[PDB]
């Protein structure tokens, strides 16, 4: 409650898509997650649902944020707080509100908070080629995604101070734990097109078919019943976390550029280590000595962002994100000048 003024002023317009996440980063001194988590979890009423104290939530955010590595240019707690902001924005949209249940909202907001915890600033493919402890521990399969969810549950339930789940009932926790794990694991790159195509095929195309019939009261209930199944709610949750995770190209230009520099610097660090250690170079284009950041951002947006956000926008209606996406794409194209 008693927040200092600059951090309070940094968190004023957090329902809005335009949000100065880097000012929140500077004002909190690399602690944006704990302050933005407290406000978001309070506004959604999360501890009322989980029956946790404000003091149990505080310790939980603390130990989760602590295990985010500040030395990572991108994969630090500021990224998680940003993904929490985009997650809350999507939940607040009319289509998600009338489709998802309160337990899903709780699963999404916790999942955004924990989804990259203890990221080492290296890709899964780096850890497998290096034979890292977590690649041997997780058998080269979704190495970091399994670690994030597992460590998050180790930190939460391992201590009575941090366990925000301790006052829940048996069945509710099993359902909520399975929801979090599924959203955290869905962020793995190799499953990108699989999760996008399942969303298009099972949601967008069926929903577009039924919208051709009309705006009938009996028709809306068929649409409501179809979307609200457990299978389709899972597919929406995977899409929502996946979009929030890589929402930075749909941000205001000033933030879009900062996120590009951070993730690029992070991939250049891995490339310097791979050449030094003799490891196979998994991202050859991302070398600080040869990489055109604007052109790599264009390739990134064409490969992962454009179709995914096209489908998500067709479902949720996200005009501001697509307008920013267009403006940012044109900015990158305009910097060539050659
Ligand atoms: N602006 C960005 N540019 C680049 Cl080069 N990578 C980014 C960016 N924002 C997040 N990432 C991380 C990333 C990298 C590759 C794929 C990816 O996919 C999202 C899902 F498929 F895993 C996310
Ligand atoms: Mg991740
Ligand atoms: Zn992430």
Cβ contacts of residue 329 below 8 Å, gap of 6+? 249, 298, 301
- Sequence-distant (6+) residues with CB within 8 A of 140 are 124, 128
Question: What phi-psi label fits residue 278: left (phi over 0), alpha (psi between -120 and 50 degrees) or beta?
Answer: left
Please choose from 196, 242, 246 the residue to mutate so as to test ligand 1's pocket, defined by most ligand atoms within 8 A of CB: 246
**Residue from 256, 258, 263 to probe ligand 1 pocket by mutation (most atoms less than 8 Å from CB):** 263
Separation of alpha carbons 249 and 301, rounded Å: 7
For residue 236 the two structure tokens come to: 């929406």
Domain hosting residue 155, numbered range: 1-338
79 is in an annotated binding site: yes
Resolution (Å units):
2.5
Q: State the total domains in the chain.
A: 1
Ligand 1 touching residue 27 (CB < 6 A): no
Cβ atoms of 114 and 155 closer than 8 Å: no
Read off the DSSP letter of residue 212. Answer: T
- Look-up: residue for tokens 């100065």? 20
- Ligand-binding annotation for 310, yes or no, is no
Residue 116 C-alpha to ligand 2 middle, in angstroms? 5
Q: Are 64 and 152 in contact (CB under 8 A)?
A: yes
The experimental technique used to determine this model is: X-ray
90 Cβ closer than 6 Å to some ligand 1 atom: no
Which DSSP helix (H) or strand (E) runs through 324?
Answer: helix 319-334
Q: What CA–CA distance (Å, rounded) separates 137 from 219?
A: 50
Is the minimum distance from the CB of 123 to ligand 1 under 6 angstroms? Answer: no
C-beta atoms surrounding 98 within 10 Å: 11
Is residue 30 a contact partner of residue 77, using CB atoms and an 8 Å limit?
Answer: yes
**Closest to 245 measured CA to CA, from 142, 149, 108:** 108
29, 51, 69, 75: the catalytic one is: 75
Nearest CA to ligand 1 atom 21: 189
Q: How far is the CA of 240 from the centre of ligand 3 (A)?
A: 12
Q: How far is CA 7 from CA 12, 23, 37, 39, 50, in A?
A: 9, 9, 13, 11, 26
Which three-class secondary structure state does DSSP give residue 185? helix
CA–centroid distance, residue 120 to ligand 3 (Å): 12
Catalytic residue status for 75:
yes
Atom of ligand 1 nearest to the CA of 286: 5
116 is in an annotated binding site: yes
**Integer angstrom CA distances of residue 93 from 99, 100, 104, 285:** 10, 11, 14, 37
After which residues is the backbone of the chain broken at C–N > 2.5 Å? none
- Asked if residue 29 belongs to a known ligand binding site, the reply is no
Give the integer Cα–Cα distance in Å for 93 and 77.
25
Could you tell me how many residues make up the chain? 338
In angstroms, the CA 294 to CA 329 distance is 9
Instruction: For a ligand 1 pocket test, name from 282, 300, 306 the mutation site with the most ligand atoms within 8 angstroms of its C-beta.
Output: 300
For atom 5 of ligand 1, the residue with the nearest CA is 300
- Helix ranges (DSSP H) in 132-284: 133-137, 143-158, 170-185, 192-199, 205-211, 217-227, 230-245, 253-277
Look at ligand 1, atom 17, and give the residue with the nearest C-alpha: 189
Range 173-210 burial, b when 16+ CB lie within 10 A, else e? eeebbebbbbbbbbbbeebbeebbebbbebbbeebeee
The residue with tokens 């990134």 is: 300
**Placement of tokens 């951002």 in the chain:** 297
Q: Is 53:5 a contact under the CB 8 Å cutoff?
A: no
User: For 40, phi and psi rounded to 5 degrees?
Assistant: -70, -45
Specify the residue with its C-alpha closest to ligand 1, atom 15: 189
Question: 65 C-alpha vs ligand 2 centroid, how far in Å?
Answer: 15
């Amino acid at each position: 409650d008693d927040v200092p003024p600059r951090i309070a002023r940094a968190m004023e317009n957090e329902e809005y898509w335009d949000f100065d996440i880097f000012e929140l980063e500077a004002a909190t001194h690399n602690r944006p997650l704990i302050y933005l988590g407290l406000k978001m979890f309070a506004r959604f009423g999360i501890c009322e649902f989980l029956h946790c104290s404000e003091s149990t939530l505080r310790s939980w955010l603390q130990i989760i944020e602590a295990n985010y590595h500040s030395s990572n240019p991108y994969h630090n707690s500021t990224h998680s707080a940003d993904v929490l902001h985009a997650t809350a924005y999507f939940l607040s949209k009319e289509r998600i509100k009338e489709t998802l249940d309160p337990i899903d909202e709780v699963a999404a907001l916790i999942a955004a908070t924990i989804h990259d915890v203890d990221h080492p600033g290296r890709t899964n493919s780096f850890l497998c080629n290096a034979g890292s402890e977590l690649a041997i521990l997780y058998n080269d399969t979704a190495v970091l995604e399994s670690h994030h969810a597992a460590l998050a549950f180790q930190l939460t339930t391992g201590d009575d101070k941090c366990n925000i789940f301790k006052n829940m009932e048996r069945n509710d926790y099993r359902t909520l734990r399975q929801g979090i794990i599924d959203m955290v694991l869905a962020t793995e790159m190799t499953k990108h097109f699989e999760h996008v195509n399942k969303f298009v095929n099972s949601i967008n195309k069926p929903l577009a078919t039924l919208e051709e019939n009309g705006e009938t009261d009996k028709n809306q209930e068929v649409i409501n019943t179809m979307l609200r199944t457990p299978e389709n709610r899972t597919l929406i949750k995977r899409m929502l976390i996946k979009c929030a995770d890589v929402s930075n190209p749909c941000r205001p230009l000033q933030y879009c550029i900062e996120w590009a520099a951070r993730i690029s610097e992070e991939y250049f660090s891995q490339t310097d280590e791979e050449k030094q250690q003799g490891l196979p170079v998994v991202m050859p284009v991302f070398d600080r000595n040869t990489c055109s950041i604007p052109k790599s951002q264009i390739s990134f947006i064409d490969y992962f962002i454009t179709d995914m956000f096209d489908a998500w926008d067709a479902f949720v209606d996200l005009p501001d994100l697509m307008q920013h996406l267009d403006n940012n794409f044109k900015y990158w194209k305009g910097l060539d000048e050659m």
